[PDB]
Every structure is written in C-alpha cells, then in structure tokens.
C-alpha cells in the first residue's frame, strides 16, 4: 500500500492482478469518539442515504447495474465504508464517496424509517451470540467512557437527528478521512480523490472526550439467548507480546471435530463449551479477554476456573515449542487479518489516520518463552480483573471466585 496525499486526504492503494477492486473510506469516527452513545453506529447506517446529487434509491439502482456491493461497519476506532466493484468502475465509486461526505441530506424521516430500524436489527443480530454481549460488557466495565462507550445504538439512549448531524460535521472532514484502495492503480486513485474530495471541509481531528481510564469490576447481564463469560484484563501498556499470548492460549480447534492442543482448548474437554483468547490493542490502552460461551452455566464455571489456572501456568513456564507455536499462530493471524478486506482497511486506516506504521506479517516478532511468561504473569497479577457474565448470571462465576 503506497501511502500518498491527494488534496489533503491521505490515500493508500495497492495495485493487483484481479478484475475486482475494493475502495474503502476509513473515518476517524468510531465509538470512542462518539459525542452521544450510539452516534457512530447511526452515522455508519446513514452512509449512502439521500445525498443532494443522488438519492439512496438511485444509488442502489445504479450499484446493481455495475454489480457492485456495499459494506459498512463501526468499530471503537473507525467507521469503515467499503465498496467492491469491477476495476474499471473506479471513478463512479470515488464520486459516490464524495457525495456521501460532502452532501448527505440528513433527513428526519430517513432516521426514523430507514436508519434507526436497520441499526436496531444489526444490534439484535449481534446480541444473538452471548459471547458478543459478554465482550461488549467487559469493555464497558473496564473503560467506562471512550473505549467503554457502546459501539452500537441502543433503545434506552436515543440518538437524535441533531446528534448525528453534529457528529457528521466533525467526522466528515479532510482531517478524519482516509481512502484505501485494494487492487486500485495508485496514481489513478490519487488523481480522482484529488478532484472529488477537494471541496470537503478541512475540519479538525476528532478527539476522545477525556483520557482513557482503566477500571475493574463485574457486569451481570441477565439474558436468555445463551450463557457466556468474559475474563478481561485491562492493559495500561499495549505490547505486541499479548498477540502471541492470545494465539498461544488459543481456544478454537485447528481441525474439524477436534478440541485443539492449546491450553484453553484443553480446558473445555468433557464440556460442550467454547473458549477464545483475544487481545485488543487500542494504542493508548489494551484489553486481554478470555470469552467462554456454552449451554450449561455449570460447565462454563468449570472452564472459567481452568482458564485462569492456564494463564497462571503460562506465567510460571512456557516451553520453547510452545513459544514457537505462539509465533506461528500469531504470524498466521496477522497474515489473514491483512488479507480480509474489512480488517485490512482498518489496519492501513490506523496507519494513515494516526501514524502507527503497520506490522507486516513477515515482521511479526518472535517472543521467547521468557517473554511470554512475563506477559502472562503480568495478567495473572492484574489488580483490576473484569468479569462479564451473560445469561443465567446467578449460576455463572464472580470476579472474587476466579
């Protein structure tokens, strides 16, 4: 991805040999920057609504004629708007992004009838998985605001048209916008973005209201969608060693109908539960999470105790083989993340919008057994353990028990 600048907008493109191009606009407008709860999710759902030059309806009818597709999502850091199309249709897609950023008519009826209903179904579908809920609740406990804001719009806190209009005034601005083109000729993109996004406001960098704070605690969410539990450990010093740690600890099976050789995978033996170690680097802070979902709350309780033990065992001693396996699993994870268009866009988006140079999968550091033991020991000795039970919370473990 050759980083450049076109009319004040950061543009990164990588040419390829395929008939299919992906163009993504990455916006610094994720939930950590949200003025009001849910506004970044609503803004994401407001992309490709009526603009002054082109109605939502006309856009969709024309997108179908090009056979293009549209993907949008919100993270804690970004809003990502992606289009996939045939190489030659690039100018149309650049112009459509420009119309969205400069000329979105934010009409009340679109919010009531189109945008908010779609945002609500989006959230209900995600929450069908209790593991999603548990990991969201864990961020809320650990950070409270900023990173602790909900990513998604909820019913209890309504977003108004004035909220979304204000936030869009901040976000849709040259300072908060990065363009990422996969299988796009870099010189052609720069020329097009330079003409289309020239009249976009400059604006200023969106910032998180307040400094990121680290907290501990519990989050009991009584649902009936299933049972899950996140054992989260908030990290004040984001380090790449936790990537190898998450990979090592593992949880998911490497092959069909197996359990997996990973410590966390060998804590589910005998039960019908599923574990997953995940590290969430957020630049200024971090979050190490072990999410156990399953049908039986008793089964989850068992695995949860084995999970914390596994972390302590790592803190004691990792073998050289285990350290090599962590490197291999972590290199592979990096590679596939840089391949997947959703995550690829945000990786370069982070490099362009912040200045955090991407770590190429081939440059992923090998951590010694000593380094991995150090990492796990720091997590075992965290003074702020966060627990987030979802489901039959009366039968799920508490922070003090673990």
């Amino acid at each position: 991805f050759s980083t450049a600048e076109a009319a004040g907008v950061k543009v990164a493109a990588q040419d390829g040999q395929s008939p299919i191009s992906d163009l993504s606009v990455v916006l610094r407008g994720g939930s950590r920057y949200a003025t009001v709860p849910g506004v970044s999710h609503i803004l994401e759902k407001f992309a490709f609504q009526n603009t002054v030059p082109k109605s939502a309806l006309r856009f969709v009818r024309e997108l179908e004629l090009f056979g293009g597709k549209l993907y949008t999502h919100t993270t804690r850091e970004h809003i990502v708007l992606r289009t996939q199309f045939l190489k030659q249709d690039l100018p149309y897609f650049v112009d459509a992004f420009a119309n969205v950023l400069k000329e979105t008519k934010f009409q009340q009826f679109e919010l009531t009838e189109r945008v908010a209903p779609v945002a609500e179904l989006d959230l209900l579908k995600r929450e069908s998985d209790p593991a999603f809920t548990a990991l969201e609740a864990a961020h809320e406990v650990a950070f409270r605001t900023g990173l602790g804001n909900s990513v998604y719009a909820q019913g209890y806190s309504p977003v108004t048209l004035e909220d979304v209009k204000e936030f869009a005034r901040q976000v849709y601005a040259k300072q908060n916008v990065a363009v990422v083109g996969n299988n796009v000729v870099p010189a052609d993109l720069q020329q097009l973005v330079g003409t289309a996004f020239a009249d976009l406001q400059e604006g200023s960098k969106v910032t998180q209201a307040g400094t990121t704070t680290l907290h501990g605690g519990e989050a009991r969410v009584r649902t009936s969608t299933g049972n899950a539990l996140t054992i989260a450990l908030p990290i004040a010093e984001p380090k790449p060693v936790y990537h190898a740690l998450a990979s090592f600890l593992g949880g998911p099976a490497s092959m069909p109908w197996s359990v997996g050789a990973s410590p966390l995978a060998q804590a589910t033996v005998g039960t019908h539960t599923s574990v997953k170690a995940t590290y969430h680097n957020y630049g200024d802070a971090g979050l190490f999470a072990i999410t156990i979902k399953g049908d039986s709350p008793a089964e989850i309780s068992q695995v949860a105790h084995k999970a914390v033990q596994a972390l302590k065992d790592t803190g004691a001693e990792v073998t050289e083989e285990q350290a090599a396996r962590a490197y291999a699993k972590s290199k592979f994870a990096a590679a596939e993340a840089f391949e997947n268009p959703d995550s690829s866009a945000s990786v370069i988006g982070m490099e362009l919008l912040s200045g955090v140079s991407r770590i190429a999968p081939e440059n992923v550091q090998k951590f010694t057994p000593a380094e991995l033991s150090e990492a796990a020991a720091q997590l075992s000795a965290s003074a702020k353990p966060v627990v987030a039970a979802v489901g039959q919370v009366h039968a799920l473990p508490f922070a003090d028990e673990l």
């Binding site: 109605s55 309806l57 006309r58 009818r61 004629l65 009409q107 009340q108 009826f109």
Partner: protein, 124 residues
Amino acid sequence: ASITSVVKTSELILKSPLLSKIVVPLAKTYVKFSGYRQLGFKMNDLIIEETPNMQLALRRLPPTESYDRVYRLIRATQFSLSHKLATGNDITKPEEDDHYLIPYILDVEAEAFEKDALDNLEVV
C-alpha cells in the same frame, strides 16, 4: 394532479415577469373568495389525504405540526356543523397560511416518481 405538477407549473409562472404580474393578483383574490381562512384552515389542510403518498407525508410531519393540524380540522368541522365562521384569532391570517406539508409530499413524490422512472431503465 400531483403536488409536484402544481408546484412546478406555479414555479414556471412565477419566473415569467409578465405571467406573474397577471397571475399573482388573481391567485390572491381567488384565495380571498375561497374563504377557507374563515374556517381557520391553512391551504394545505385541504389537500386530499386518502392516498398512499399523502398518508406517508402526513406520518412524516413533526409531532407539533401534526397535533396542530388535528386541532384545525376539528375546529373547522365544528364551525361547519354549526354554520358559523371563525372570528378573531381563529381566522387564518395570510402570514399564518404556511405550506407546512408541501415539502414532505414533494419528497415522497420525488421518490415515487424516481422509482417509476428507474423501473423502466434500459441498459445501453
């Protein structure tokens, strides 16, 4: 006739200096003799509402405009059944006769008409 048609034709007339000079005074007299303001109506209160398009535009009204329209209809119905005219503050003054509904119905119809056009597009 569509509200769109009426609004566009009126705009053609208002553009032409000659046409506006002759039509605008007639339209103002027409409205005075129409006498809907003597029942406390605004012009847009009279538009036929029993259409999908109009029902959609009425649902999009801000709640305040919607509640006030309900009151003006009930109040006019009460003047009609009593054979009375509005007096005092109930009479709609020319400055109060605002086109509160026209923008909503023009947006509904714009979409409806674009949908019809796009249903008939031919790939060239």
